[PDB]
């Protein structure tokens, strides 16, 4: 059970912290092609990706 429970948060909801923390600290690459995404005012293509 410690190989389920003291086997730690895997239960891996720190990947959600990677999803918001990497939705903010990695928004400088996906939005770097997509700053204007659904238009062309700041002239960028609507592409960011769903990976992770």
């Amino acid at each position: 059970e410690i190989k389920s429970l003291e086997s730690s948060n895997h239960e891996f909801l720190l990947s959600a912290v990677t999803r918001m923390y990497t939705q903010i600290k990695q928004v400088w690459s996906d939005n770097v092609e997509e700053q204007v995404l659904h238009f062309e005012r700041i002239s960028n293509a609507t592409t960011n990706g769903e990976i992770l």
Binding site: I24, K25, Q26, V27, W28, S29, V32
Partner: protein, 77 residues
Amino acid sequence: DQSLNKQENEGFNRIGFLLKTINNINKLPVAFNIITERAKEEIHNIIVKSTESIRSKHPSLLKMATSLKNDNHFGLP
């Protein structure tokens, strides 16, 4: 350094650019920042800057043009 993670002449390059450039947390726009500033404005900044520095350092552009040294006194001095 790539093979490491696969003054030593000059350790400041990989050292400062490593511990500087790896300690960015949202680096991917900032790479484009240093690129798009530094290309034009740095290249013309240096290539302007040195010729300025001589251009008032000990100028005297006297030997103003050629001092008419004909013609084909082509960088004679």
